[PDB]
């Protein structure tokens, strides 16, 4: 088969230039096209026939293909460029795509804004309890959350979700939800989520006690 | 206007069955253009399925699908269809149509993508609980819990609030989906004025607003 090869990640600075590579054997003999895809959105054609640019596409986007490496170049990177990039060619009656390259913009370290939320009155009546911890707008990506019910850790019960890097301030968000039976909720008192993030040596704690809410 | 390719809605199908997604050239044509379909399993990348030139009655298919997949177009020749038979759990993916000029290779117009879920899991309606500080700047949330299948849509004050919002990718548990959204506003805003959470599950005819 024919094989296009894209690096999984390319991170660059705010303002500097991003270069994404599409390698394949004798690729300079093929007309190479590039697609940008942001989270949720459909792909958008950003470069075709190696160097040409479609309508609506910023001049900052340029391409080159010679030898065994086609290169997409994005100049003066903004957070509005955070997206997955696909490289595409034709080869023997078939369309071949590369695996995504995720372009991530670097930025200042930010601590997570942590916010805990009790179960709802409405949910409680249904018979269930879920506690939600929101860890918002932090950087770098990596974070750990610990859920503690009366100072004891709980590992199982939890469902976590992370946003794609934010298009506006290049930051990250996480939602962690500890969901129980209502009977369970009622057997203990303090519910705690501690966030372990690089910006601090001491984890961040948001808690509440049932007898006060 | 410049052509807008519009696909039919999210579908749910049980294994063994067929699915047929529509691709209409709102404000344009599919004639002497290449119509192409491409899919994407969640988390993974793009997978070409086939091309078709209605005006030549010739197709080309990815070996992988040839031929469970069948790309047809309408006379008018204004809508394109992809029919994929013999469905299986593997075929759960967003399905895109796109359109390239003849003999160019690229596709410069894409549809908006249609989700196809291939399961036997029964359509369950979501349940929407609000998130507030029960107990400087305020952070609030909706919790959309225990639904199936994807997707839902979540709005804040019907889009009049878009900034400060963080909607999270659903996750699946015990064969069910859960999703949260958080919105943070200035403390002079809640609860001085009201925040409402606008959720929507088309699969179960579920539309739910949620104050606070």
């Amino acid at each position: 088969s024919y094989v296009l090869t894209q690096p999984p990640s390319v991170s660059v600075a705010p303002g500097k230039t991003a270069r994404i590579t599409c390698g394949g054997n004798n690729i300079g003999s093929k007309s190479v096209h590039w697609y940008q895809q942001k989270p949720g959105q459909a792909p958008v054609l950003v470069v075709y026939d190696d160097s040409d640019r479609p309508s609506g596409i910023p001049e900052r986007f340029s391409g080159s293909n010679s030898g065994n490496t086609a290169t997409l170049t994005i100049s003066r990177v903004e957070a509005g460029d955070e997206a997955d990039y696909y490289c595409q060619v034709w080869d023997s009656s078939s369309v071949v795509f590369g695996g995504w390259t995720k372009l991530t913009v670097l930025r200042a370290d930010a601590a997570p804004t942590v916010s805990i939320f009790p179960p709802s009155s409405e949910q409680l009546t249904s018979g269930g309890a879920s506690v939600v911890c929101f860890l918002n707008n932090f950087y770098p990506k990596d974070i750990n959350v610990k859920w503690k019910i009366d100072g004891s850790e709980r590992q199982n019960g939890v469902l976590n979700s992370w946003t794609d890097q934010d298009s506006k301030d290049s930051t990250y968000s996480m939602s962690s939800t500890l969901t129980l039976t209502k009977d369970e909720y009622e057997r203990h008192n303090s519910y705690t989520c501690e966030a372990t993030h690089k910006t601090s040596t001491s984890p961040i704690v948001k808690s509440f006690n049932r007898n006060e809410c | 206007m410049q052509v807008q390719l519009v696909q039919s809605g999210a579908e749910v199908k049980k294994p063994g069955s067929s699915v047929k997604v529509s691709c209409e050239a709102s404000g344009g044509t599919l004639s002497n253009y290449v119509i192409t379909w491409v899919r994407q399993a969640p988390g993974q990348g793009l997978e070409w399925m086939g091309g078709f030139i209605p005006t030549f009655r010739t197709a080309m298919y990815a070996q992988g699908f040839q031929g469970r997949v069948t790309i047809t177009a309408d006379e008018s020749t204004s809508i394109a269809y992809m029919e994929l038979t013999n469905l299986r759990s593997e075929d759960t993916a967003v399905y895109y149509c796109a359109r390239g000029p003849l003999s160019r290779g690229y596709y410069d117009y894409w549809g908006q993508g249609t989700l196809v879920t291939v399961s036997s899991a029964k359509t369950t309606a979501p349940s929407v609980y609000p998130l507030a500080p029960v107990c400087s700047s305020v952070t609030l949330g909706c919790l959309v819990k225990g639904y199936f299948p994807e997707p839902v849509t979540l709005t804040w004050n019907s889009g009049s609030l878009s900034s400060g919002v963080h909607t999270f990718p659903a996750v699946l548990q015990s064969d069910l989906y859960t999703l949260s959204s958080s919105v943070t506003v200035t403390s002079s805003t809640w609860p001085s004025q009201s925040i409402t959470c606008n959720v929507a599950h088309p699969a179960s005819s579920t539309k739910v607003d949620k104050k606070i």
């Binding site: - | 030139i53 003849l102 290779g105």
Partner: peptide
Amino acid sequence: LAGLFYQHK
């Protein structure tokens, strides 16, 4: 024979 989909530069 399918040069109706791509050209050879």
